[PDB]
Structures are given as C-alpha cells and as structure tokens.
C-alpha cells in the first residue's frame, strides 16, 4: 500500500493546535481547505459515529459498493483463496515427509517462480482462469489452472 498517507493523519491534531493558538481555521486557501477537509474525512471521527460504525449493515453495504465497482479482491468475507504453495525440497533427504505446522494467507509476490523460470509476460500472452474440476477427482488437487 502507499505508506505516506499516514502523514495526513497528522492533520486533525494540527488543526486542534490552531484553535489553542487562536489562528482562525477559516483563513486558509480554498484549495488547501478542500485538501485538508478530505484529510479529515479520511481520519477523523467522533464518539457518536464511533459507537455506530461497526453495524453489520454498514459493513455489508461497503462490501456491496465494492461489488458494483468490481473490486472484491482485498475484502475478507468476499474473497476465497484457493492456491496453496508447496514446500521446498532438501537434498539432505527425499525420505523426510514434511507436513504443515501452520497456515497463513500472504500475497504471492513473496514466493513466486522467478522471472527467468516462467514464460514471458503471462498477463498479455496467456489467458488463464483458475477453475474447479467438474468430475469427481479421487486424488490430487480439486483446483486446476486452465
């Protein structure tokens, strides 16, 4: 994500100081007051709103707004992760049977086949859909890449 946005979180503090110093907040360029108002609308909230901001309705409506604009990717309830990453093999032993101690969902750019191993740009030259087998599979993976 883009980090430096946190500096905007500084603002509702600075604003408060302006009141204590007696600098009127209404003398600001209209430009900057728009920018800063947007900053407020990002991070500031009251006690009032905060008691109610976790209503399930509001959460799900946000989910819906995301659905109509077709960004479901990051949401919690609304994504289903499929692909697993397999273990690394040791030359110290093939015999050793590894198994999973813990499992965590992390972005694929941590470990993904190095750029020189895979075919050239896959986004442009290959149309790939991850999909489920319709038949019963007796063993192996129930998700294959088409």
């Amino acid at each position: 994500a883009n980090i430096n946005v946190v500096e905007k979180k500084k603002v509702p503090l600075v604003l408060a100081q302006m009141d204590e110093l007696g600098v009127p907040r209404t003398h600001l360029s209209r430009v900057l007051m728009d920018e800063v108002e947007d900053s407020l609308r990002k991070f500031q909230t009251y006690r009032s709103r905060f008691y109610e901001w976790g209503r399930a309705v509001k959460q799900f409506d946000f989910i819906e707004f995301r659905r109509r604009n077709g960004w479901l990717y990051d949401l919690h309830l609304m994504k289903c992760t499929t692909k697993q990453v397999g273990p690394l093999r040791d030359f110290n032993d093939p015999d050793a049977v590894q198994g999973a101690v813990a499992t965590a969902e992390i972005p694929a750019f941590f470990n993904e086949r190095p750029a020189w191993e895979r075919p050239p740009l896959e986004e442009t030259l290959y149309v790939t859909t991850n999909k489920e087998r319709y038949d019963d599979v007796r063993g192996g993976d129930i998700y294959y890449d088409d």
Binding site: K58, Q59, F62, L72, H76, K79, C80
Partner: protein, 49 residues
Amino acid sequence: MLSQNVAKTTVPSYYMIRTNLPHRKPQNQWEGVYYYSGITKRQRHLILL
C-alpha cells in the same frame, strides 16, 4: 456475470452435520473496520467547477 462472485459454500449435504469443519471464516483481527471516506464523481465535478 461477475467472476469474483464465487461460491462461499460447499454443496448442501451431510458433511456439514457430521464434520467439525466450520461454516464461516474466523474474524480477521488486523482487518480494519470498513467505513465511508470518499466522494462522488458528481461531488468532484461540483468542487472543480
């Protein structure tokens, strides 16, 4: 229609009843609370104009 609308449930059956597999994801602790911060195309237009 929309390809990220993808079944969150397995086909209804007795596996739901006879197994300890849970029916939902557990809450993610570090997921922020979804809240509304933002503007419309209409509002941006108004401000610029």
